[PDB]
Amino acid sequence: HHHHHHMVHITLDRNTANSWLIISKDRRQVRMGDTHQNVSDNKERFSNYPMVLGAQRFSSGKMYWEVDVTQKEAWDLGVCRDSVQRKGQFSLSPENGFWTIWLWQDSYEAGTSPQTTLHIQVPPCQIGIFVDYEAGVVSFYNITDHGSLIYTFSECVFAGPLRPFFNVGFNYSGGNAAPLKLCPL
Ligand SMILES: CC(=O)NCCc1ccccc1C
Numbered sequence: 001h002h003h004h005h006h007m008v009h010i011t012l013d014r015n016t017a018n019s020w021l022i023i024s025k026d027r028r029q030v031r032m033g034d035t036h037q038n039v040s041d042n043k044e045r046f047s048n049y050p051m052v053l054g055a056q057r058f059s060s061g062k063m064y065w066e067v068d069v070t071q072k073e074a075w076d077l078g079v080c081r082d083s084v085q086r087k088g089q090f091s092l093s094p095e096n097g098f099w100t101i102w103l104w105q106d107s108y109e110a111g112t113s114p115q116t117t118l119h120i121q122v123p124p125c126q127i128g129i130f131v132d133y134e135a136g137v138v139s140f141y142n143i144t145d146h147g148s149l150i151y152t153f154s155e156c157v158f159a160g161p162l163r164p165f166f167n168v169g170f171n172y173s174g175g176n177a178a179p180l181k182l183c184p185l
Contacts, residue, residue: 001139001147003130006064007185010054010164016044016086017052021168024179027055031179032171047087054164057082063131065164066143068181069103070125074169075180076102077127078111079138081160099138099153100165101127110151118150126183131162143183 011027019041022033032050046052058079067077081097084090092098092111100111101118108118120142127150128141136156142148171177 001128001130001141001149003062003064003128003139003141006062006130008056008063008065009185010056010065010182012166012182013044013053013055013163014039015042016046018046018050021050021052023052028182029179030166030168032168032177044086048089049167050169051076051165051167053080053166057161057163058131058133059161060133062133065129066183067127067129067166068125068179068183069127071178072103072169072180073173073176074102074104076100076111076165076167076169077180078129078140078165079131079162080165081158082163083160094153094156097159098165099156101140101151102167108150110153112153116151120150121145122148124150129164133158133162 012023019036020033021030023030078100084097092100093113108120110116122145124142124144126143128143130139138153140150169176
């Protein structure tokens with residue numbers, strides 16, 4: 001792909017983070033802590049899952065960023081509406097305001113309803129995410145495999161400002177402690 005020139009500098013919004021997450025000083029990396037991280041609760045924090053939003057809000061244009069997922073067993077990545085539900089149980093779907101892919105139990109799936117099987121021959125260490133607001137497109141690229149397409153959501157009905165979306169996943173196995181990292185331009 002040739003989307004690299006729409007690169008945007010994404011930073012994580014502490015205030016949206018699940019209370020167990022640890023965000024680096026530069027706001028570019030996030031990982032699951034072993035316990036509650038000693039912050040007060042607020043209506044923005046994701047309660048049920050280890051999720052956090054980027055600070056940036058997009059309502060027009062073309063945006064591109066990259067995320068490092070090296071040695072993780074489980075994660076969700078993409079974009080969501082600024083007004084997605086924060087508390088309780090919910091599914092990642094466009095009906096609920098999410099345009100995402102994930103890794104879970106050695107398979108990759110797109111967050112459609114119901115979910116769609118992805119066909120990945122080279123497990124990615126870094127994912128590229130492209131959003132075209134006007135066209136209603138969210139695309140995912142395998143940076144490890146020369147930028148090969150993973151999945152395109154088209155005819156997206158964003159219905160609001162968009163925010164970058166992250167889930168570091170649980171670490172019940174002891175094999176999923178590694179961080180998500182926003183990769184430099
Ligand atoms: C997964 C696990 O066993 N967590 C341990 C967290 C804990 C609890 C009580 C005292 C000290 C620690 C580190």
